[PDB]
Amino acid sequence: APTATVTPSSGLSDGTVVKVAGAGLQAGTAYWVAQSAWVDTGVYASNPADISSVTADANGSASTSLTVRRSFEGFLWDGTRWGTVDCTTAACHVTLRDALSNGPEGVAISF
Amino acid sequence: APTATVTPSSGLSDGTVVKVAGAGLQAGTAYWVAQSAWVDTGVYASNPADISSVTADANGSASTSLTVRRSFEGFLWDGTRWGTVDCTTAACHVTLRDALSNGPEGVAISF
Numbered sequence: 001a002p003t004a005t006v007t008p009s010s011g012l013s014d015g016t017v018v019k020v021a022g023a024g025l026q027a028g029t030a031y032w033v034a035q036s037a038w039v040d041t042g043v044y045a046s047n048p049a050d051i052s053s054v055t056a057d058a059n060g061s062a063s064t065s066l067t068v069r070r071s072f073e074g075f076l077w078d079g080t081r082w083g084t085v086d087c088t089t090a091a092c093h094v095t096l097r098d099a100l101s102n103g104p105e106g107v108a109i110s111f
Numbered sequence: 112a113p114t115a116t117v118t119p120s121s122g123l124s125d126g127t128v129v130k131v132a133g134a135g136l137q138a139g140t141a142y143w144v145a146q147s148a149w150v151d152t153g154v155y156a157s158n159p160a161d162i163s164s165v166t167a168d169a170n171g172s173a174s175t176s177l178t179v180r181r182s183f184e185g186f187l188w189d190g191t192r193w194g195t196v197d198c199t200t201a202a203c204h205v206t207l208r209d210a211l212s213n214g215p216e217g218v219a220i221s222f
């Protein structure tokens with residue numbers, strides 16, 4: 001099943017560029033590569049601003065470049081502007097989800 | 112029925128702040144606010160960079176600030192990294208959609 005990795009996953013800051021990668025993905029499929037923080041139970045606030053994208057290769061595998069920040073203005077996956085997120089408090093992490101939300105587990109991160 | 116308006120729309124450049132306004136929206140409904148180009152008959156390629164959003168007030172209205180750019184690396188609404196968009200040939204426009212794609216008709220812009 002889908003796998004996901006980020007690097008560096010710890011010891012980061014605002015602007016620090018990391019390498020997100022995934023596996024078990026559906027070949028040719030487009031996977032959103034964004035950062036988030038479960039603002040609520042089951043719900044996320046992510047940063048479009050530095051958002052990114054990855055398409056799964058033949059072997060459901062791919063990769064791309066992200067640029068994480070300590071704090072960001074947050075948006076829900078429905079469009080809601082949740083405003084400013086974290087400053088080191090709650091746990092942001094990198095999301096890899098497609099058109100149907102399908103994706104691996106959220107790779108927790110820390111600042 | 113739902114309504115949409117930008118200002119200014121014509122005579123634009125790179126980094127231009129526009130005034131998007133909605134109407135006949137569903138109150139409490141979240142509308143992403145993005146610069147996009149019909150890269151295909153139906154399809155759009157958006158700038159996730161300067162995105163905005165607007166929560167319809169009580170009578171289905173609300174507004175916010177958008178900052179346009181002549182050209183931009185684009186994304187399809189499925190996560191696909193489209194690649195660079197326009198330079199003044201194709202007709203980007205400001206889209207206003209909620210999580211179900213619903214929303215009023217994109218208004219024509221130009222640099």
Ligand SMILES: C[C@]12CC[C@H]3[C@@H](CCC4=CC(=O)CC[C@@]43C)[C@@H]1CC[C@@H]2OC(=O)CCC(=O)O
Pocket residue numbers: 032033034045046047048051075076077095097098099100101102
């Ligand atoms: C694409 C998506 C809505 C748009 C989200 C995306 C996660 C990444 C993301 C981060 C943002 O901050 C902008 C919106 C966005 C790009 C979500 C992952 C799944 C979701 O879609 C749905 O819940 C509906 C799809 C379905 O019917 O399964």
Ligand SMILES: C[C@]12CC[C@H]3[C@@H](CCC4=CC(=O)CC[C@@]43C)[C@@H]1CC[C@@H]2OC(=O)CCC(=O)O
Pocket residue numbers: 143144145156157158159160162186187188189208209210211212213
């Ligand atoms: C949310 C959305 C995909 C994510 C899009 C959003 C338009 C605004 C937007 C701009 C970007 O550049 C990032 C993705 C994104 C936030 C689209 C509007 C409708 C679309 O699809 C759906 O969620 C509906 C799923 C379906 O209709 O099958």
